[PDB]
Write a protein that binds this ligand. Sequence first.
Ligand SMILES: [Mg+2]
Lengths: 380, 245, 1341
Amino acid sequence: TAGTPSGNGVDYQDDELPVYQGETTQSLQDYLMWQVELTPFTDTDRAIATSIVDAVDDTGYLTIQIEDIVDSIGDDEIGLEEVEAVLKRIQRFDPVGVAAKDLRDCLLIQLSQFAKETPWLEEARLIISDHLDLLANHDFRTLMRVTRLKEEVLKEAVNLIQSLDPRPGQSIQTGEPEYVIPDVLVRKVNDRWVVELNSDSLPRLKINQQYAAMGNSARNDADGQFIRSNLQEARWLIKSLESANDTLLRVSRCIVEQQQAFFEQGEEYMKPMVLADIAQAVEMHESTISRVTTQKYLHSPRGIFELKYFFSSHVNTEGGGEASSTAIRALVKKLIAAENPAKPLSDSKLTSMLSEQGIMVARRTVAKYRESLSIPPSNQ
Amino acid sequence: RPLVPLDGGRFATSDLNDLYRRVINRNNRLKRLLDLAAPDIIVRNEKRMLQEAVDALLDNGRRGRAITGSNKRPLKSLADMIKGKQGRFRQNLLGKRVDYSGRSVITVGPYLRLHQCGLPKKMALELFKPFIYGKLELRGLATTIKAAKKMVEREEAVVWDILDEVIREHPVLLNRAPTLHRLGIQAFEPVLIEGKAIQLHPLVCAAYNADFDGDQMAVHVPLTLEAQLEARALMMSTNNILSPA
Amino acid sequence: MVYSYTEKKRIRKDFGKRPQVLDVPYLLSIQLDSFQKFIEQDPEGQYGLEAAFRSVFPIQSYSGNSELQYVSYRLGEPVFDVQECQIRGVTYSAPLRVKLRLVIYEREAPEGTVKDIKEQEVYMGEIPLMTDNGTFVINGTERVIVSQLHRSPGVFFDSDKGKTHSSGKVLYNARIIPYRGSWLDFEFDPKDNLFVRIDRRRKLPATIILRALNYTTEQILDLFFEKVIFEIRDNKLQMELVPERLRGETASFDIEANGKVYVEKGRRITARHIRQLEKDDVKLIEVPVEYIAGKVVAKDYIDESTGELICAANMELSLDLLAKLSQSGHKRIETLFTNDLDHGPYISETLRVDPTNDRLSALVEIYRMMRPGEPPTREAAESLFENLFFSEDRYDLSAVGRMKFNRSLLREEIEGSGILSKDDIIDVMKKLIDIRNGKGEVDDIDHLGNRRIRSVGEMAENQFRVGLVRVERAVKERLSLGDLDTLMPQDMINAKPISAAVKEFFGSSQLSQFMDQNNPLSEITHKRRISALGPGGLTRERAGFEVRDVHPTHYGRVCPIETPEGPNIGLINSLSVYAQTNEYGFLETPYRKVTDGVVTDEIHYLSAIEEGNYVIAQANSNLDEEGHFVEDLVTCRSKGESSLFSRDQVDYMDVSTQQVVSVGASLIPFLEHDDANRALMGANMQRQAVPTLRADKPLVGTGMERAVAVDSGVTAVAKRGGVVQYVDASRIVIKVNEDEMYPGEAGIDIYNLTKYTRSNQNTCINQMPCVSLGEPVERGDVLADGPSTDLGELALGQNMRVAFMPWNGYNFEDSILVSERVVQEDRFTTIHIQELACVSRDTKLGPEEITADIPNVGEAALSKLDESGIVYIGAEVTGGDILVGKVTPKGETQLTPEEKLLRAIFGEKASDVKDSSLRVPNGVSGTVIDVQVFTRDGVEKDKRALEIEEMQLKQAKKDLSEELQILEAGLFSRIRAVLVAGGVEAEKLDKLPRDRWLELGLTDEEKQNQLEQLAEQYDELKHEFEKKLEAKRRKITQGDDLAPGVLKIVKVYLAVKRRIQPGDKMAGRHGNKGVISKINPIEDMPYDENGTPVDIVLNPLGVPSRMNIGQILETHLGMAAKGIGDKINAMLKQQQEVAKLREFIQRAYDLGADVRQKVDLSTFSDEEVMRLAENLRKGMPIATPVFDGAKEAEIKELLKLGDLPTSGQIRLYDGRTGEQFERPVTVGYMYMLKLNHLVDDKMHARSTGSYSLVTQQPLGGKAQFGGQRFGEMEVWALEAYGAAYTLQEMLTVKSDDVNGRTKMYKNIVDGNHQMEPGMPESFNVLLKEIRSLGINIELED
RNA sequence: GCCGC
DNA sequence: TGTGCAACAGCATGATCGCGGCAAGCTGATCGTGCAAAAGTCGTGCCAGC
Ligand SMILES: [Mg+2]
C-alpha cells in the first residue's frame, strides 16, 4: 500500500460488566418529540402531536393523511379543525417546514416566517408557490404572462424559491453509518483476469479455535481427555468455514470466466447469465448458488460491485442470438445522452435505432428502460 | 445483550450470545439424535456436553476450565454480570454517572468569602442551561424553545445577564475524587469568573486535603427546592466547621 | 582543537574539580547494537536471521527422499524513506529474499540423488527496519521497543523464607529454567522427602524420575548414600574405622584399638580423642552386635546355597536375620552411612514412599500423573519422557542457561549441550541435598547477576523462529505430495505466517508502544528503559515489595532515582549513564584498574559478581599527580557493604560519581542537596515539559545537555562537514573540504531542515539553522537545532527571575504568582498541531465523491473551500467549519410525482445525496497548514493534487541540479585548461558556448584524446542526470495502491498557539510543581532599588518541609550568572575596547577552587572574543556536575565578582504601596518548565447528552460529553450529611430515570423545580438478569 | 502508559 | 487385652485484595439441497393524452 488511511474512531465499554453496552442517538422524531414536550399543549393536543409526529418520514414529511390522523384518534371533538391547528404548530418547529403535507406546504410554511419586507416575498409567496407550480417546474415562459410580470423579476423570484429549503427535516439527521463495503472478493487485471478471495480469516479462526478448544483439551490439568467436548467442535467450525469459502470462490470464478467480456474493453458486454448457466458450470443446484450471490460484493478496478448484476436474463429476442437489457439499458442511456438540444429520443425512434443496430426490441420495452432511471427529453 | 457492530455491515456476537448459541446448538443436536434411536454412548456424550454448555452459560469457569472466545480470555457469563466491582451492584447502582456535572483544575482565591467559590463562566451556561432557557422564555426574549436554544448557542450579552441572575442564589457542590469523609464534598455559592479553573477558599483546603499543584474537583448542581435547601442548611462550608470525628 | 566550532560560540563555565578517565557513551547504542546483531548476517550461526535459518533448515518430508537446502539471504532496499513512510501512514520495512535449493534423492539408490533445482531466491515477509535513532516507523508512527529484564535460564535454589508450616521448618527447593521447554522442581516436605514437580503438576517423589533413567534402587543407594562395610567373621563382627565421619556419637561399649583400649564406653567425644585415634594406625575393630540393629542394609547380598536372598534394600536387619546371613556365607555386609550429624536420611525415605522399581513402571506412572487421560501402551510414556526434557526440539537451555547451570554447580567447562543429561539432574539433586545438610547457601533472586536483559533484536529473532517453525510445518506436508515439477515458491513458501508473526510482534505487543515525543530527553529516556513486565516477565499484582526495592548490585547499572510512582514503582527502571550489557545479557559498569598504590587509566567492565569480588574505591577519593591516593585510609565497597580500607587494598576505582545517576537525573543541578524520593519527582517531571516558541539555555546546568541534545538525533549534525555554502530556513548546503573526499563525482552535503510537524503528543517539531554563511564546519558540529534546543544544548524551559516570599495568599500551598511581562513576552507559549482526515469509499448506493458544491448549505460555509472542495492553505477555521466537502449517494429507484416535482424545481439530484463532510470538531480552533491528498490508481487525479505533485517535482529538481551544475563546472574548467594548453583564445574561447565548437581539433593528440574524452564524459553525465531526473519524476507521480474500498484520502493539519494561563501547571527540576494562581500587572510585582521587578513569586514554605535545598542554590547561582552577564552587557553597551572585555571574561572564566576546565582567551581570535561576549551577554552559562560541583564559597565569590550581595538576598519594595519589605527577600534566576497539563484539555461541563443503551446511564469522559461519576464514597458522604433529597435526585432522575429525566427538564424549563422521582432502569436490568438465572425475584405490594 | 491522592 | 469411637492435623478449594480522571486500542459471518411451492419479474402488447 502506497498510502494507508488512519484508523477510524472506535470505542468499547471499559470497567463495565456488559461489555460494549451501547449509545443512544438522536433522530428526527426523537428531536421533534423533545420539542413537543417543551411546548404548552393539553392532554389531547399532546396525543395528537405524538400521533402526527409518529407519521413523519426521515425527510420530515407527513406520510399519512390528515383524515387518517383524525381516524386514528377515534375521539369526539377531535375533528380535522383542531388536528390542523396542532399540525401547523408542529410545522413551526426548529426544522421549519417539517411535517408538511406536500411540497407546496413546505414552501408556504417556510415563506411565512420572513421579514415581510423581502424584495420578492409576496411575488413568490403565493403567485409562484401556491399557483402555477407546474409552470415553475417547466420553463415558465408563459408564467410571465400569467402573473402579469416581466421575465426579469421572475428570474430572481425563482431564485428566492430555490433559496427556500427543498426538503426540510433531513438537516438535523446525523448519518453516522456510511454503509461501506469490505469487498470480500477482490479481483485484478492480469493476462487472463485472475480472481482471489480476501477477508477469509479462516486460518485466523483456525488458530484461535485451536488455542482455545484444543488448548483446553491439551491442558492436562483436567482429568481424562477432552477429545470430543471441543476438539471435535473446532474441526466442525473450520470445515464449515472452508466449505463456505470454497463454494463462494467457485461460484465467483464461474461468474468471472463467463463475464470476462464485461471487464474487458467496454463495460456493457453482459451476457444474460441465468442461474442455470452457472448451476451446470458448478454441477450444483441454482438455489444454493443464488442464496450465495445475494449480498456478496466484488472489488473491481472499473466494474460494478455486485454479483447479482451479471444475471440479466434479458434475451429480448435480439436479432442474432440473444442479448442483455442492462447492456441495452446502458446503450439507451448513452444514445439519449448524446443527442441534439431538441433531443427527441422518441420511444418509437429509439426502438427503430436499436433495431437498426441489431437489437430487436419492442417500442414499449425501450420506454420502460428509459423510465427506469430517466425522463423523456420532451419526446411527447 | 446486543451484539457489537463492525465496519461495513458485519456484526460480532457478544460473549453472552455465544453461550446461548452453544446451548441452543447442543440442545438441538441432542433432540434430533434422540429421535434416531442412537446408541447410548453417543446419547450420554451429548447429554454431558449439553450439561457442560448450560453450566458454562450460567457460571463460566465453574466445574472445569472456562470457555474462551476468539482471544484467550474467558467469556463473560450471567454470573460474571451481577458480582464484583464491575458488576451492576457496585458499578451501575450504589454509584452512577450523573448529568449537570463539571470538572477542572482548582486554584486559590484569597478574596473569597468562606461560603463562596469561583466558578468559570464557561462551565456555567452549560450546567445551568435549562434554567437559562426558562428565564429566556419567561422574560419574552424567546417565545419558542428553539429560539432560546439558538440564542444560547450564539451567546449574546443578554444571555450572560440572564446567567448571572440564574447564579444569583443557587448553591453548588464541589467534590474531590478520594472522598474519605463527607467533608469530601461541600456546598458553595458560585461566583462567576473569567477563566477555566475553579477558585477554592484557602480555609477549606485542609478538610478537602487539597493543594494547588494539579488537583481537580467535580461540580454538581442541586436543581430541586429540597436539594437547594439541603445544600444551604446541611452541606454549606459555614455549617461544618467542627470535624465530626 | 581545545574547543569545537559550535562550542567556541558559547562556553559553559564548568566547576569540575575531578578529571574524567573516560567520556559518556551514545546511550542509544543498545537498541542499535541489538538490531544490528539481528538483521546483520554472520559467517557463523552466532547472530542474525542466519541462526534461525540454520536452526530450522534443512527440512525433509518423512520418507520423502526430498530436502530443502538453504543458502544465504539478502535484504531489499526500502521503497520509501522514514519521512515519506511517516507522512503516508505506512510501515518502514525491507523485503526479505532468501536463496534455497530443492534436491530429490533417489529411491532405488540409497543416499543418492537424481535432481537438484537451484532456482533463484524467494520472497517471504517484510522485516521492519529501525531508524538511525532507534525507532520503528510502523503504520506511520514511532513505536520504540522497550528492553526487558527477566530471570536468566539456569538453576536456582530458594527457601520460601522458612515460614510455610508455622513450625519454624525451613523448606528448601531447587528449580531449573530453560530458555524454552517445561520446568523442573525439587522440593522438601516437612517430613524431609524428595518431591519432584514437573511442569507445575502434582507433587511426585524423586525416586520415579531417578528410576526412569534406568537407575536401580541399589545403584541409587550407593550414589545417594556412602556405604560402610560390616564384616562378621568367626563371630568377631568387626567394624571398619572411619574416624573422620565419627565426629559426634555416644560409645555404647568400650572401644579397643588392636586389643588396647582407645575410647571407653560413654567416654566424652573430643576433637582430641578423635585425633589420638587417627594418629594410632588401627585395623578393623570389633563392636557390640546390638549397635548394628539400627543400621540399614545398602546392597542386596545373594545366598550361594539357594536363590532366596534378602534383597529388601532400605530396610533394617533382625537378630534372626543374622543367623540367616551367617548360614548363607555372608562374611561382609554393606550398609549405608546411617549417620545424622551433617548428613541425613534422604532418597531412601522417598524410596520407601513409592514402590515402583522398574523403568517401565516409572514411565507409565509419570505418563499417567502428568497426562491423566488414556493409559499408555509402552510407547506413549516412552515418547512423552523424551518430549519433556533432553529433546533437541522440545526443550532447550540457551548458551546463557548452560553457562549459568555449569557455574552454579562449579564446573570448569562453560560450553555444553543445550539439553540436560543424566548427570545434570543428579548434580542438582545432590547440591539441593547438601544445601540442607549445611554446606552451601541459598542465592538471591533479585541479585542483578541472576537477572538478564532481552533487547529488540533477540525478541525479533524469537518471533521470526515461531514463524519459521509454523511455515516449516506446512512445508513438510507438501513435500510428500510434491512432484519434481514443484518449485520452492510452489513448495509452500507460506509468506503469510512469517509476516503475520513479525507484524504481530512489532505492532501489537506489550513492549511495543509510541515513543514519548514531548522533549528529546523524554525520547532518550524511553529508548533507554528497562521493564520487568511483558510476556516472559512478572505481572504487577504478582510483584512484591522485595522485587521493587533498590538492590546493592544496582549501583552502576540502574539509577535508584528514576522510576514511576504509583503502580509500576520499582518495576520500570532506567540504565545508568555508563552501564553496558554482557554478550550473555548481564549489566556491566566500568572501573579503573589499580596497580600497587596508583590507579591506572585502563578501564575494565565488571558484572555484579565481578564487582562484588574486588574492593572498589569511591569516585570522590583524592589522588596525587602520580596517581597515588592523598589519604592512606580510603572508603570502598567490598561485598555489598562499605568501610575503610588501605589504598593498596583497593583493586578498582569508580570512574565517575555520575556512574550511579541516570541521564535524566544527571540533568538536575545540585542533586546531592535534594531528597532522593523528591528528586524522583523532578526527574519524572522533566520529561513532561513542552517546547516553547523560543528555546532558552539553562543558566545553571550540569554539562550533560550537549550529549543529550546531540545523541537524541533531534538536531542536524554535520556528517562530513566542510564549509557552509548556502543557508536557508529549510535547507543547508555544505561544500565538503578537499582534504577528505570520495574519488569521482566530487560531492556536496545537503541537509533538509525539518519545519513545523506533528509529534506523537500533538506538539510541534521544528528545526532552525545555527550557521549563517561561509562558516567553517568541522565533523560532528551542529548545523540546526530541533525542538527545545539552543546552539546544540538541551533547553527545555526558561530562566525566570524569582523571589521567595508569600504574596497576599496568591502563592498559598503550591500556587505560583506570575507577572504579565511573562505573558507579553510570549515565554511559555507553545504550538500544537492536530491531524484530521477524510476518506471516500465506494458504497452500495455508489461512489462517494468529494466536491466543492454541497446540497442544503449556504455560500458562507463554502467561502474557504477550493474548487475541489478543500479549505484554502492558511485559512483560519473555528467551531464546525467545513474542511473537505464530501457527498454520499442515496438509494432511490421509485420516482414519486412529488420527487419528480422536487427534481423539476431543484437540481437533478434534488439534494438526494446526503452530506458527510469533514467539519472541525467543536472546541478546536486551527489554521490550515498542510493538505495531503492521496489518490487511487486509475481514478481521476484531484485538482488540488497536481499542485502538490508540481511542488514535489520542483523541489526534487531544485535539490538535484546542484551536483550536476558543480560537475559540469568542473568539466568546463578541465576543458578550459586543456584549450589553454594549446590554441588558447582566452575570452574569445570563453564567449562561444560548447567550448567554441570544442576549439576545433588543434593538435592530433588533443582532438583524439582530450576533446573526444571530454565530449564523451559530457554526454554520459547529461544522460545520467536526465535518467535520474526522469526516474525521480516517475516515482513522484504514481497511483497510490490503497485499500480496495478506499477511493481517496485527504489529510488536513491544523496549528494553534496555547497562551499561558493560571489553570496551567508549571514546575522546576527539583520536584517543585504548582499551578498558576494569578497573572499580575507589572506595576504590582515586587521590585528592587533599580526598579526591576521579579517575574515569579514562590512560597518559601514549600522548601523546608520538602528538603529541596537545590532550589535555593540554583537560585543563588543563577543570580550570580545573570550578574556576570549584566556586567558584560553593560561593557558592550559603552563600546569598550576589546582588550579589557577579554580581560574581564578571562577573570570570570578562571574563577573557582582548582577547577579542571582551563580556558585562556590568549589563543582566541579577536573577533571570536566579540562573538563569545555577545553570545553570553544575557548570562554566563555555569555547569555544576551531579555529585562534584560548585560549593557555597565559590558561589559567593562569583557573586562578589558580579558586584552582588554575598547572602543572595536583596531589598524589595511593594509595587502597590511602595513600602520596603522588612526582611531581605532572596531574588535570583531559576529554570522553570511548562508541563503538558492544561485547563483547556481539562475543563468539561455537561447538562444533558447521550446515554448508554444498557442501564440508561450517561456516558463517561470528555471527548464523549460524559457526566461525572457519583461513586460509592460520594453516596456515603451524602448519607452522612443526611441529604436524602439530593441523593434521590442524584440516584434516580438526572441519571437513569428515563421518564424522570424528561419530566425534570420540563419542570425546570417551566420554573417548577419538582423531582417527581421514579424507578432506575439499572434495577430493572438487574431483575431481568437475576430472573435469567433459575431464581424468581419479584416486587410485592 | 500517565495525573491527583 | 483387643476393639470401636470421637477429636484433631494436614490438605484442597473458594473468595478478596481503594478511589476519581486522561490517553491508545480494537472481534464475521458456515451448512447444503432439490424441490416444489410460491412469489416475483421480464418482454410483450393494451388504451388514454397531446
Ligand atoms: Mg496536589
